[PDB]
Amino acid sequence: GSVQIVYKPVDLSKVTSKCGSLGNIHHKPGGGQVEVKSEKLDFKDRVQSKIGSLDNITHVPGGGNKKIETHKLTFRE
Amino acid sequence: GSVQIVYKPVDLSKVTSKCGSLGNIHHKPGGGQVEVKSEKLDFKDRVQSKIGSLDNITHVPGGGNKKIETHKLTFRE
Amino acid sequence: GSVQIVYKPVDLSKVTSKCGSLGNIHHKPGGGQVEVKSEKLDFKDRVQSKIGSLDNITHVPGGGNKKIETHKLTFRE
Amino acid sequence: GSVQIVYKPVDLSKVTSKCGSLGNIHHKPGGGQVEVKSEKLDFKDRVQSKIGSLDNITHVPGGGNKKIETHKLTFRE
Amino acid sequence: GSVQIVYKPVDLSKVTSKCGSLGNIHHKPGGGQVEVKSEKLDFKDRVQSKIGSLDNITHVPGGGNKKIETHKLTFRE
Fold this sequence. Notes:
5 copies of one chain form a homopentamer. Chain A is mainly β. Chain A is 0% helix and 56% strand. Chain A is flat. Chain A starts with a strand and ends with a strand. Chains in contact: A-B, A-C, A-E, B-C, B-D, B-E, C-D. Strand 4 (22-23) of chain A pairs parallel with strand 4 (22-23) of chain B, so a sheet runs across the interface. Chains A, B, C, D, E: Tau/MAP repeats lie at residues 3-33, 34-65. Chains A, B, C, D, E: This is Microtubule-associated protein tau. Chains A, B, C, D, E: It is found in: Cytoplasm, Cytosol; Cell membrane; Cytoplasm, Cytoskeleton; Cell projection, Axon. Chains A, B, C, D, E: The record marks 8, 14, 18, 28, 37, 40, 67, 72 as: Not glycated.
């Protein structure tokens, strides 16, 4: 038995952004107080962790346009 | 028995944004108080965790347009 | 028995945004008080967790237009 | 027995937004008090959790237009 | 039985950003206080961890446009 698979996706997309003035962003955190207490941490497989943090992020992109593709063709008998 | 599969998706989409003035954003947190207490943490498989945090994020993109595709063709007998 | 599958989706969509002035956003949190107490945490498979947090997010995009596609063609006998 | 499947969806949609002035947004939280007490947490498969949180989100997009597609063609004998 | 697989995806996408003036970003954290206490940490396989941190990130790109592709063709008998 012949098996013919044609996998032809076509993509002409566009992700466009236009801005005139990104200005005057003020990010002013006012301190903090973090206390974490533990005894045993056992992480095993594919672990992303944050135990104690006080994090300030100022993320100002002129673009920031994400675009995620995923093509998956699985073939078995 | 012949098996013929044609997988031809066509995409001419667009994701467009226009802005005139991103201005005058003030992010002013006023401190905080976090206390976490534990004894044993056992994380095993594909784990994203945050135990104790005090996080300030100022995210000001001029665009910020996301677009997620996912094509999956699974074939078995 | 012949099996013929034609999978031809066509997409000419658009997601459009226009703004004149993103201005004068004030985000002013006033502190806080978080206390979490535990003994044992056992997370096993595909876990997203947040135990103790005091999080301030200022998210001001000039766009922010999301668009999610998902094509799935499963074939078995 | 011949089996013929034609899967041809056509999409010419649009999601359009227009704004003149996004201005003068004030988000001013006034503190808080969170206390959570536990002993054992066992999360097993595909778990999204938040145990103790005091979260302030200011989300001001100039667009913010979502659009979700889902095409699923399942074929078995 | 002959098996013919054609895997021909076509991509003419574009991710475009235009900005006029990225200006006047002020990121002014106000200190902090982090205390983490543990006894045993056992990390085993593919582990990303942050135990005690006080991190300030100012990320101002003129672009910042991400684009992620993933093609996967798995074939077994």
